[PDB]
Design a protein around this ligand. Structure first.
Ligand SMILES: Nc1nc2c(ncn2[C@@H]2O[C@H](COP(=O)(O)OP(=O)(O)OP(=O)(O)O)[C@@H](O)[C@H]2O)c(=O)[nH]1
Ligand SMILES: Nc1nc2c(ncn2[C@@H]2O[C@H](COP(=O)(O)OP(=O)(O)OP(=O)(O)O)[C@@H](O)[C@H]2O)c(=O)[nH]1
Ligand SMILES: Nc1nc2c(ncn2[C@@H]2O[C@H](COP(=O)(O)OP(=O)(O)O)[C@@H](O)[C@H]2O)c(=O)[nH]1
Ligand SMILES: Nc1nc2c(ncn2[C@@H]2O[C@H](COP(=O)(O)OP(=O)(O)O)[C@@H](O)[C@H]2O)c(=O)[nH]1
Ligand SMILES: [Mg+2]
Ligand SMILES: [Mg+2]
Lengths: 428, 428, 48, 431, 428
């Protein structure tokens, strides 16, 4: 009941998924052999939301690893938690995508869907009651963005009732991870506005401050950032897996969050995050979780919420606590700094709780914000796109795959409207 | 022969079901395994062919994540496994889903239980509806269920204990909407509807109980103390045994006005009893105190149409008629002119029971007041503001319209509230 | 929540920016309506 | 049955409350743990269902630092925790904060206690107010509270035992202001107003008790000996029983003139009580003595309009009427023409009790005098002088007006003293 | 309740801020580890005015160390009591300040205000009810005088109702620790006339003689002068932290002190002060403390009382003493030398008292007086300012930071308007 099927697209997706399935596995006390070795009966009761029973007491994940150039898969196929995956769920192409949204969506991606769909359905029907899909993308490259969206449009029509999530990692403002990044960005956005129920945005930049400011790290490697992203992807489905005195399914989290069908871009954070020195001073009380999650620093995206208004928000607390302190705090903020919250929504936060904190903590939280500052990711992208599409630079690669050019402008009008939707509703 | 049917709908429905049914099992020496080491329990239980005392209630919900806790808790040998009804997918805080899509496919099951739950019943007092307005399951299923109960029995009485959305505390954003939609369906179908807000019961736990980490499990340990006091006459000897029909006749002047308030006294910590005597005189002054209300309404802005007082313990009627007499004279309490009377009083010799691990104190005198007042228009006009503030933009509508609903159901359920508030002013 | 970055910039301080201003000596709104009657005027002489 | 409700406001209000309530728990054998090893106490307490006797008083203040002491000291199991009302921040010696900013949100919490405290007494004799005029809490809240007590109860008797600003000894600089503003609110709302100054009781500690180290813990121990001598007729059998209604009836000639002085006697150490006899005639002479007054005023500058007398101990009426007869012949003591009478005398067979570690002597005779004199118009004029001395410069005003006030409040409360001044010569008509 | 928050801005602030927290930490029996090791429960009663309970029962300060060029912070990070501070409450910039008011107020200041404000509010909410702020300055320098007032201009606008004290160290009359002492003085004083509720003035000159004449010290290290400054700063909150037969909170001290909103420049002292030898000669009685506190030596500022008129005064005694003695003493003083006091104030002193002396003593006192001789310092400095500004010496340094000349004349006139305020009320 209430199963979930999970997709990992691209190099980034095939690497965030490495830590995600490592984090969730430990939380349910299963070995890299796949055998359950936990203690409580609380791990087993909702284990089938991510895994499947197998002969011998194994628990194999319900993930789908898709990628061109399986080189990066050979890493995770060799890592410590690489022995758990089904080998038939590895779908890959022998050629490369070349950081090119076109061939990752038109030529090569189109050659794998016939096989990918036999994979997704084979484990979508084993679900006695499917809850939804969830993907992990990278809006910079070609494989993650291109094949990701093409996979979505096939998913959106085959399963329109169920809900698809998206932990899309978006480009960084101050540095360019690739050169053709703005082309792959918009052409993917133009697919997400229409074919996604919810979509969180992350940035490798903000993922550095939290390790440079909050965590006070020294050598933050991607192996650590993915331990951050995996902390929110685990923080969403707690109510699905663990009981709590105020549960929150995955669906009731959208209807309380998205007023209009196109503003489905969010902004996430996590709490508590302290150094290995400060854990001696700072205490763990709901007033602490509530201020650090609300701050303009734990926002894992590089968009300052203090430039717009909060339409709605959320909070998924974890750990046996007092349901009153939570309710009075989240209330105390809205009427405290009343200039950042819209007025035609009286109470614009939802609050969840769980009897089960993380594996090694006592209290924890997770934040989801739908702010009208998310438009700032789109302006900064809408300009870098129009500076180079203006002179038709790097386009012979995209048109070389038979692409048109109105698919570029349609990707810009669709965006340059989405930047206005976030302004009528922001009366400042 | 003096028996009732106790329904629990939603999460808070079964959240209070765990407090109420932990009381009656303890108030009658019923072990969690059914049996105990007549008519003292026949109000709530049914002795089988041998020894076992199963309750007569029904836990109804859509998320198994809570109804299964009852299946694994210590009260699993107690319930008939069919009473604990549950579903696969949830209402997702969306009145439409709980009414049009998912509600229609399990009511046919729930209703069969009631038919098999009423045949053993020889003389049925009335149904008992524990509901939580503000969620899809609480508002949608509850609405769809009540209409089915009206057309089956009609002559039987339905009592609605519905948690209502508070002014400040709000665990959701769209809870204004489905709280409005509930009225058009509860009003014509419930015989009488008690109200109580999660916020008002919070402050009760601050001044009186002096408990600083309140939780849903605390408040429910107060509601159970109401119904225990309310149905004491049904199962415990006492001067002026008050049934339901008697209770209902002299409280509801007009078929519309059946929205009433509640109170309780004394509510004190187990140590401040050492600083008080808590006479019949002292308690009844505190029942009419505005801070002792279980709803955030102010009775000093309105007038009383009736009151009902259920005393308990070492109480004799010579002191009831005295304390009531010194209240009609008090200036603060204003009684609407067309009732010079207004008190139906009930006495019991069975003092209120205390649960191990509870917060209240063992006392020998206790009072539960239930007043029908015209100040109730306050809490009912706040909703008329938040609904008209968000509905001006059709926010969150595309969720309701996408689940087999329409735009008329919003304006229709809106006029019914205006049609109601006039009725709370014609009585001036 | 604080202010967005770059908006806490220092501003110019004029002379007497923060200086209270006496409104005026003016008759107050409510004299509060003394309840007790005054002392008689030592010349009533009601005795006869 | 014969029940009164005691209030304590501000710091001095509760710092005398720790003295009176140390006295009553001792005067009725009430252990600090509520209980003891009818109607002998029912004036001040109320049995619960479990042994204890809880006092029917109210400690109210805006400073937690003085209320928590009560919550930690030996007298913590006594009070119902709800009666000890405190506040987050204080008034900061400002009449505005006690009247417009902070006082407005706690009174409802106080009144809900008073109402819960009124029903528990079958017959209410009257309220007792222990005020401290000169601060923000004592004056600002006492102002605001006394009004609300008049609306909810009306003609019920509210006494006032309010320490007043002393001429020389003064621990404040702004206490002129918040004293003046208080007058109208007490005048029109309190029924009777006893007065006493921190300095006047210093010299009495100097000459009589001969304690060259006097602090507030000494002065508060004196006021306890006053009220116990005043409310003995409420809870102790004795000839010529005198209640509160009988008290103000034949003591307050006009609704305005309700200020009066106090004098206790004898005040003697534990050793001079052996060099002494303390006859009823000697004591009552030292009672009318100006040096034994509890206010820095001079009775030989004005005229006595009425006097009350609460005797205590082995006393018989034949001796009261005899000594009083002498004073009526004494020329040093004047009396306004229109009172050939002028004494309401009370007797109580129960002598005063001594506190262990106290400074007085165990005596079987005592006298507590309270006289409504017109000489009290002196201590009422120094305030008129200092107030105008500062107010001619608008000094310290930006505080008062900066907290929800205007300038008119000064002139009203200023004239209310001017009018009240002439009344203290009007009544001295002598025609 | 009545929580404070302490700021230490500059080299002086960061250094005297060390000795300050060294004294209070002892006064409440806590070790540099941060654990409590006192004897009485009285220590833990009002500890929350300066500290924050931590995990495992620690007490860390609520200070804020802000300074450019963290060099001097690396010292206090390495002192004996350097383990108590939260490392997060350290604000430093990699650039020098140059003993220049401009860049400490315009360029370098503006780059750290985002952090400092994000720091102060993290704890301005950790207070259940904030009493007020408290800072330490060095008016000659650039960090303490530029960032100091810049932070104040921010503090005054978000928390105007609360109170902010200032232990500003003013320039010396004869020696000049800096060549640009005037410009840094006036430009800061102008900021203190508008944005300060109270402002003590302490001078390094008077601190030497008191350490030379009275204390007979041979080599007075700055560690000794700050054992003095720490003594008086601790002497103000004894009514807050400890009981007292006549308590005196922080607010009722200003109301009772400043007759007009501008004359908030005070003068302090501390008693008793004796050599190691004379301890055996002079008794410790209240007439002793008041004889030395009223003297013209213990004035930590270099302003002579015998030149002007005391507008008001104060005294905070500490010890089980006789409150008659203090009242008659302070009365005699005004009585005998009755020309040093103004006449339109009848009694112009306050007199607190506390049941608790310092940890090593039995009776102590502390003095605060608002004289009219304070106008002399602003006369001595307003002459040096107009001396070199008339020829524009060192001005190319200030104007290089976007400053102007109106920001100079404004500063001077606003000071000259203040020196007249202190002359009218001096009727000789
Ligand atoms: N007094 C009390 N109120 C509760 C409790 N649990 C939830 N509530 C309130 O009930 C409201 C939501 O009702 P739910 O039952 O959780 O939601 P639902 O009716 O099941 O509909 P779905 O969430 O879509 O399944 C919230 O406002 C809660 O504050 C409880 O245990 N005690
Ligand atoms: N007889 C006596 N007088 C006291 C005592 N304590 C303070 N006083 C006097 O009360 C007057 C000041 O009023 P306080 O009660 O201390 O302060 P407040 O009225 O509560 O106003 P805030 O300080 O703002 O709380 C001064 O004249 C004190 O001398 C005491 O214990 N006994
Ligand atoms: N959090 C995280 N992000 C990564 C990591 N590796 C790459 N990314 C981002 O992924 C982007 C490039 O997309 P990529 O996945 O390499 O191309 P694709 O194979 O076509 O999807 C770049 O913006 C990288 O910064 C990683 O290891 N951890
Ligand atoms: N009491 C005391 N004063 C000091 C000390 N050190 C410096 N001061 C004063 O600090 C003043 C200079 O300001 P400073 O803070 O050092 O430089 P800034 O960082 O630019 O503000 C000088 O007048 C010093 O006398 C000290 O250790 N103790
Ligand atoms: Mg629900
Ligand atoms: Mg006070």
């Amino acid at each position: 009941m209430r199963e979930i099927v999970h997709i990992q697209g691209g190099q980034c997706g095939n690497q965030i998924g490495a830590k995600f399935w490592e984090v969730v596995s430990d939380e349910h006390g299963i070995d890299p052999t796949g055998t359950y070795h936990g203690d409580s009966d609380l791990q087993l009761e909702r284990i089938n939301v991510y895994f499947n029973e197998a002969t011998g007491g194994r628990y194999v994940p319900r993930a789908i690893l898709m990628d061109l150039e399986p080189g990066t898969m050979d890493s995770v196929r060799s890592g410590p938690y690489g022995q758990i995956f089904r080998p038939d769920n590895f779908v890959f192409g022998q050629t490369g995508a070349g950081n090119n949204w076109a061939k990752g969506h038109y030529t090569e991606g189109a050659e794998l869907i016939d096989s990918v769909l036999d994979v997704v359905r084979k484990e979508a029907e084993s679900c006695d009651c499917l809850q939804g899909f969830q993907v992990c993308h990278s809006l910079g490259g070609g494989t993650g963005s291109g094949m990701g969206t093409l996979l979505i449009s096939k998913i959106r029509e085959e399963y329109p009732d169920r809900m698809m999530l998206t932990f899309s990692v978006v480009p960084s403002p101050k540095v360019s991870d690739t050169v053709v990044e703005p082309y792959n960005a918009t052409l993917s956005v133009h697919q997400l506005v229409e074919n996604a129920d919810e979509c969180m945005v992350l940035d490798n930049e903000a993922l550095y401050d939290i390790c440079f400011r909050t965590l006070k790290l020294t050598t933050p490697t991607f192996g650590d950032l993915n331990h951050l992203i995996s902390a929110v992807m685990s923080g969403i489905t707690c109510c699905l897996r663990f009981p709590g005195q105020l549960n929150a399914d995955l669906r009731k989290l959208a209807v309380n969050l998205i007023p209009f069908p196109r503003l489905h871009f969010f902004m996430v954070g996590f709490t508590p995050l302290t150094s290995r020195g400060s854990q001696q001073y700072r205490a763990l009380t709901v007033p602490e979780l509530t201020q650090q999650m609300w701050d303009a620093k734990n926002m894992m995206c590089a968009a300052d919420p203090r430039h717009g208004r909060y339409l709605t928000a959320s909070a998924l607390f974890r750990g046996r606590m007092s349901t009153k302190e939570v309710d009075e705090q989240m209330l105390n903020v809205q009427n405290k700094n009343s200039s950042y919250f819209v007025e035609w929504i009286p109470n614009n936060v939802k609050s969840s709780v769980c009897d089960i904190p993380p594996k090694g903590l006592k209290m924890s939280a997770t934040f989801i914000g739908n702010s009208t500052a998310i438009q700032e990711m789109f302006k900064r992208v809408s300009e870098q796109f129009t500076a180079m599409f203006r002179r038709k630079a790097f386009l012979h690669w995209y048109t070389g795959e038979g692409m048109d050019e109105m698919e570029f402008t349609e990707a810009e009008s669709n965006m340059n409207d989405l930047v206005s939707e976030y302004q009528q509703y922001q009366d400042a | 022969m003096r028996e009732v049917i106790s329904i629990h709908i939603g999460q808070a429905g079964i959240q209070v079901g765990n407090a109420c049914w932990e009381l009656y099992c303890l108030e009658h020496g019923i072990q969690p395994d059914g049996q105990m080491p007549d008519d003292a329990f026949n109000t709530f239980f049914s002795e089988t062919g041998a020894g076992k005392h199963v309750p007569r209630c029904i836990f109804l919900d859509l998320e198994p994540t809570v109804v299964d806790e009852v299946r694994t808790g210590t009260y699993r040998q107690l319930f008939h496994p069919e009473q604990l009804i549950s579903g696969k997918e949830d209402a997702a805080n969306n009145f439409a889903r709980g009414h049009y899509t998912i509600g229609k496919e399990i009511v046919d099951l729930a209703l069969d239980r009631i038919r098999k739950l009423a045949d053993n019943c020889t003389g049925l007092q009335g149904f008992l509806v524990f509901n939580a307005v503000g969620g899809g399951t609480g508002s949608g299923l509850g609405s769809l269920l009540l209409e089915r109960l009206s057309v089956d029995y009609g002559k039987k009485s339905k009592l609605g204990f519905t948690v209502y959305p508070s002014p400040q505390v709000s665990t959701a954003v769209v809870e204004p909407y489905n709280s409005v939609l509930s009225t058009h369906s509860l009003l014509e179908h419930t015989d009488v509807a008690v109200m109580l807000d999660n916020e008002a019961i919070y402050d009760i736990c601050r001044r009186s109980l002096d408990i600083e980490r309140p939780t849903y499990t605390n408040l429910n340990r107060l509601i159970a103390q109401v119904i225990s006091s309310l149905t004491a006459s049904l199962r415990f000897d006492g001067a002026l045994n008050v049934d339901i029909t008697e209770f209902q006749t002299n409280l509801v002047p007009y078929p519309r006005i059946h929205f009433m308030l509640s109170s309780y006294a004394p509510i004190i910590s187990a140590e401040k009893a050492y600083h008080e005597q808590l006479s019949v005189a002292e308690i009844t002054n505190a029942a009419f105190e505005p801070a002792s209300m279980m709803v955030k309404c102010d009775p000093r802005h309105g007038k009383y149409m009736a009151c009902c007082l259920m005393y308990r313990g070492d109480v004799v009627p010579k002191d009831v008629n005295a304390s009531v007499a010194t209240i009609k004279t008090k200036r603060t309490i204003q009684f609407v002119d067309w009732c010079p009377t207004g008190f139906k009083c009930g006495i019991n010799y069975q003092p209120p029971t205390v649960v191990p691990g509870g917060d209240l104190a063992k006392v020998q005198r206790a009072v539960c007041m239930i007043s029908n007042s015209t100040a109730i228009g306050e809490i009912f006009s706040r909703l008329d503001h938040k609904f008209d503030l968000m509905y001006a933009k059709r926010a969150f509508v595309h969720w309701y319209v996408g689940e087999g609903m329409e735009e008329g159901e919003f304006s229709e359920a809106r006029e019914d509230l205006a049609a109601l508030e006039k009725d709370f002013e014609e009585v001036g | 929540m604080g202010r967005p970055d770059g908006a806490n910039g220092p501003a110019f301080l004029h002379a007497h920016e923060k200086e209270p201003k006496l409104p005026s000596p003016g008759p107050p709104s409510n004299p509060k309506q003394k309840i007790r009657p005054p002392v008689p005027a030592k010349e009533e002489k009601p005795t006869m």
